[PDB]
């Protein structure tokens, strides 16, 4: 008689790499690198806050684009291509620092500055870029300081915010840099202005410079923003004779949350923990080749089209 031992095989045998062989034929295999992408953001089980056209920095200032996003709590913030947080042109000092500090947080909560001004001073200054309810306006959590009487030099005033809370607050302010002398002198004064902010853990001198520069949004002049973090049970003082644009309210950033930068759409019937510009990555696999630029709980980025893991013995055909 005769009894034979033997093993299964297949026709369409699948090729895998080993320590010794670059083309080993095996029965079954499995991909370990995710190559297929998703171009939709998946926010099920997530208290997200889609900003859209609102840039993170505008939320502290209170631009007409960010009316809805002045307050709130979340675990995710999202930012778009070309998000505008500036009516009146110019950048903000140490921009990227502040920007990601906001996108790191999980909410903005406001407190009132409590800043009263003299009878002579008008708080409700405006501009033509910043429009709310159809017509002209200014930033919602700032107030533009300017004297009522056109010509008279603006008086040296001292204002002080006090941090009563057990947590820290983010006091933003601004400085106007006119390009002309004619509307500069009658709004503020014919003098050279001084603006000296001062805290326990911050201090600075500012000079409103005048320079020839191409107009932006019908304005030749520019305004720039400065900020610091006033401490628990600490005060900040602002000394100025015009130029300063003090804040009506100061921000507190709350808890933790992701920061996603993408142009992709939003779906709430889908859940995920890995994101990028393109969209979401919803896969059990350990590796991916979509992007090295990702956020959350991601598969590692690998410079490989495919990697096949053998799930069965050598295929021996005939």
């Amino acid at each position: 008689d005769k009894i034979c031992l033997g093993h299964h095989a297949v026709a369409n045998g699948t090729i895998v790499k080993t320590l010794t062989n670059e083309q080993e034929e095996v029965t079954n295999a499995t991909e370990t690198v995710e190559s297929t992408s998703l171009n939709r953001l998946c926010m099920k089980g997530r208290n997200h806050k889609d900003l859209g056209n609102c840039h993170p920095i505008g939320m502290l200032i209170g631009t007409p684009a960010c009316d809805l996003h002045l307050t709130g709590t979340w675990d995710t913030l999202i930012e778009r291509k070309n998000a505008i947080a500036y009516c009146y042109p110019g950048a903000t000092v140490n921009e990227e620092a502040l920007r990601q500090k906001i996108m790191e947080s999980g909410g903005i909560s406001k407190i009132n500055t409590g800043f009263t001004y003299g009878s002579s001073i008008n708080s409700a200054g405006t501009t033509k870029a910043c429009m709310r309810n159809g017509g002209n306006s200014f930033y919602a959590e700032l107030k533009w300081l300017v004297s009522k009487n056109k010509g008279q030099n603006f008086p040296q005033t001292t204002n002080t915010y006090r941090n009563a809370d057990t947590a820290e607050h983010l006091i933003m302010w601004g400085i106007h840099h006119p390009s002309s002398t004619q509307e500069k002198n009658d709004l503020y004064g014919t003098q050279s202005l001084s603006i000296s902010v001062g805290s326990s853990t911050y201090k600075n001198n500012f000079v409103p410079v005048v320079g020839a520069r191409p107009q932006v949004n019908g304005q030749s002049g520019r305004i720039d923003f400065h900020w610091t973090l006033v401490q628990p049970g600490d005060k900040i003082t602002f000394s100025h004779n015009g130029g300063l644009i003090a804040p009506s309210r100061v921000s507190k950033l709350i808890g933790r949350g992701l920061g996603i930068q993408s142009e992709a759409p939003i779906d709430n019937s889908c859940e995920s923990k890995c994101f990028w510009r393109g969209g979401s990555i919803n896969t059990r696999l350990p590796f991916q080749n979509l992007s090295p630029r990702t956020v959350g709980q991601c598969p590692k980025y690998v410079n490989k089209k495919s990697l096949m893991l053998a799930t069965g013995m050598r295929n021996v055909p005939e």
């Binding site: 008689d1 034979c4 095996v26 930068q261 990702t294 490989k304 799930t311 295929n315 021996v316």
Partner: protein, 172 residues
């Protein structure tokens, strides 16, 4: 390969065989008949299932973004960021290639091993009643019915039952 049982002394595998990885094909008076083995085919897959459970997963570590998508950050730190992001990727790339290579190598040889282990389990049962063909077959020197052939496959066969008979069939 390492154990020389698959692409080994066994010329080829069996395309006809499904519902099993390793098993048997006996030839006797009653005629040709196939059959599969459970203990071997399960030990193989359970070992592979163990591998899929470990390799098919990711870290729970939460990474923030160090780069602005819509702004160019300071040129010197973006160069530091680029240099580490490139360096890390070369590591994860090397680690992936080496993981799957060595696991593929071990998967292949583990299977070969379970095929060898069975062939040896059958051999030691048959004791002095059978002889090795060389192609992974045992010639039996005593009449073996489907009851006798099943007693081989089920690890219940008794060698002393047909010993005196077989020895004199081998000696001739």
């Amino acid at each position: 390969g390492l154990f020389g049982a698959i692409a080994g002394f066994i010329e080829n595998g069996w395309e006809g065989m499904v519902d099993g990885w390793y098993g048997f094909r006996h030839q006797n008076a009653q005629g040709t008949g196939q059959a599969a083995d459970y203990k071997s085919t399960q030990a193989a897959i359970d070992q592979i299932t163990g591998k899929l459970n470990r390799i098919i997963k990711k870290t729970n570590t939460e990474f923030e973004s160090i780069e602005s998508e819509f702004s160019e950050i300071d040129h010197q730190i973006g160069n530091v960021i680029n240099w580490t992001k490139d360096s890390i990727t070369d590591i994860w790339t090397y680690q992936a290639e080496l993981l799957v290579a060595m696991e593929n190598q071990h998967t292949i040889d583990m299977a070969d091993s379970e095929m060898l282990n069975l062939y040896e389990r059958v051999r030691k049962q048959l004791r002095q009643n059978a002889e090795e063909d060389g192609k992974g077959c045992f010639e039996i020197y005593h009449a073996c019915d489907d009851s006798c052939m099943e007693s081989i496959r089920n690890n219940t066969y008794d060698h002393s039952q047909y010993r005196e008979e077989a020895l004199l069939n081998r000696l001739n």
